[PDB]
Amino acid sequence: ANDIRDLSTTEIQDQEKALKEELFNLRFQLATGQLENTARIREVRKAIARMKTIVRERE
RNA sequence: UUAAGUUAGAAAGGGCGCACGGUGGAUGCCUUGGCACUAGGAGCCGAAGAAGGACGGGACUAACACCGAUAUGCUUUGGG
């Protein structure tokens, strides 16, 4: 969370994209019954929310 | 033996009493909820989009509660 604040906005924006790609893949593996560590999904969702919160704070 | 006479007993089923069960949810005890007030506070919300909703959000989610595509939560300050 503080580590996110060390990054630039553009750098944060890139981290979001990466997390959204990850979240999509998790949901895809979950659907095909190949996930196992199902707790990752919640982690990633929160992370994305954290990014978007920091960015909105910047403005 | 015959005759005359007398009287018993009987239960297909039923009645009364008793015993033991079933059904049913009265009664007692209990209280998650109510009822009436007192003292203080507060007496408005809305185009900066209200009241009230609909549909969604969880690993799996039918319902409730919570939340809004940042969705079963995000940041921060304190408490613990």
Termini Cα distance of chain A: 17
Asked whether the beta carbons of A23 and A41 are under 8 A apart, the reply is yes
- A41 CB and strand B closer than 7 A: yes
Tell me the structure's resolution in angstroms, rounded to a single decimal: 2.3
Provide the number of structural domains found in chain A.
Answer: 1
And the tokens for A41?
A: 């999904």
Rounded, the Å distance between the CA of A30 and C1' of B42 is: 52
Structure method: cryo-EM
**What is the spatial distance between Cα A40 and Cα A21, in angstroms, rounded to a whole number?**
13
Helices A9-31, A39-58: inter-axial angle, 10-degree rounding: 160
Q: What is the DSSP letter of A7?
A: S
Residue A22, domain extent: 1-59
